[PDB]
Amino acid sequence: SVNVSKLNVDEFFKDRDGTFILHDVQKDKTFIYNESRAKERQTPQSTFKVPNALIGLQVKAVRDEYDVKRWDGTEREFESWNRDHTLGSAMRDSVIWYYQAMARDIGEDRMKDWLHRISYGNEDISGGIDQFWLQSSLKISPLEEKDFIEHLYKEDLPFDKPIMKTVKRMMIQEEGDHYTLYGKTGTDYGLGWFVGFITTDNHSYIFVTNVDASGTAAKNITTDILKKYHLITN
Template structure:
């Protein structure tokens, strides 16, 4: 188990999770949506904003569906023939498969189809981080102008889980379905990684766990890769007996 101690705020508990990070700077925030208790490691960093990288695929998909820039999760975009970093990217993709395989090019094309005005308007409506898309319509979330904190990610995912975002029920349920990482007998894990590919110096894992007893929302970032952030998150969730 990970030890926790109450802070001055009764709903906030500090996680003593240093061993999970192996000396690499990072933070994790986990919220129980039934009790509203928030568990956090490195509270100071949890309020610091970083570029969302591929975790932005979640709001990008929501906005794209709501604005009918894409009709559903099955809509395919044809690969343009440009060979990119990962073989799995170098093929046709649907909205859902590009989410699962984190194919950046698909979501860059989707952002261009949404366009700056509609993108800016929607980011303002959902209060997503600093709402800054000045880095370019197909680049602003990739080590660029858009920034968001782990605490803000948790709030955003919480609203998605509770379907209180200003989007249609169908749109939110579609994206939640696309985010499923694993389905077990007693829980379903929904998540999305993100990695700053230029230097692997920032990794994210955000999402939520749906259990019989409660929903748990989480966001982790670390000065490493999204794979590392996911591994830390899963181990923390296991030690807290959430999964």
Template sequence: MLQMKKLSHLSHLMVVLVTLVGLFAYSPSADAKPGVRPLELQHIFHDTQGTLVLKNLKTDQVYQFNPGRSQQRFTPESSFKVANALIGLEVKAVADEYDVKRWDGIVRDFPVWNRDHSLASAMRDSAIWYYQAMARDIGQVPMQHYLNRINYGNRDISGGIDTFWLDSSLKISAIEQADFIERLVEEDLPFQKKTMKTVKRIMIDDEQDEYTIHGKTGSRLSDMGLGWYVGYVETDRNTWVFATNVAESGATAKQLTLETLKTMKILKD
């Protein structure tokens, strides 16, 4: 009789244990997010030092190439034009995307810079002087205020109001860039909806029937030893955020990003 009671007690204990194991093994949650998947892109990057962060906003799946570098902070260079444009529009340092600044007559490195520019054309042609002038019009206090609010990298503008993002004090990682772009796509930044829609529009880099790419390059002009391409691509099915940096130019970062998007069948050849 005692033996039977022991067996019954043991059976009950086993049922409880199996139930608990099942609960821990299967714990569905609406908030659960997929983990980070590695990207094997050596056949695309070859000897180029760099990283790429990619996120599917429909599934929340994140992909990374060279995750160690994706967490390192670098100066954003001209990829900062995205944040700069948001802040400039918000504080009315510029009226809209068509607001023109007259060329000051100083001949700069690229002929396309040596003319009058609007906010939109200066984004497209990466005319640094326009965005430097706008940063001066924004001013140090508002600039710092908004960089703090959007938590942009290390938020350090001590390098000077019109140079802090150019091989200077401000630094940001590829992961942080991707997060910033995602919040812009979702219009979840502390700016007016109109401001965010305008900046997304002037970021359009390529528009096809099957997709639209919104992106901005950035290059460290002193040695072309740092390049960025950040933005997002909209397709019929998904929206993908990307942030790439390399130890070469922004043009290289863009090329490698596009090759990756084609390899992953996000873009069609």
């Protein structure tokens, strides 16, 4: 079994400055590469979709993971964005407009009320009910991202128990034979997020990758770190 305090991932953060956080749930040991970066607050970008999904389900602004919002016909950057989407599928492809239509329904007040309840970074939605998390006022540190995620894994959050399990199922990236990979990406302005967790037989871990590349680059670093420590196989 892995000792997450003997970890070294320098070979993975060559060619792009970033940070990595892996917390053994059972053994209660957190490893941090580049403690400095892990401690500074940044835009959550699309990682905020996980809290936005919880609040939106909690206050019944959307129904389940399948709540359909029809595409408005505006053709946007990515083609996966230009079709009908649900809550889950919009979390899969980071379809910003779905979660934007949802945050408008959640409302300034309930979004400020819940952000202070789950202590998400600086809680500042001053940038707009549908903008604060996208290169704007709201900013959270990767370490605060790990903590939030850890809470959602343990279900220590003040959301309904089935709601947290609906959001966590939505974050599934790979259902391997010996592990289930959970996580959300975030991308923009040369900064990439990957936040989630991984379960094996008798083990589960919270991780947070943050790097000067894309989200996809952040996820590929994470899955590479996890492969180097026998956490991801097949």
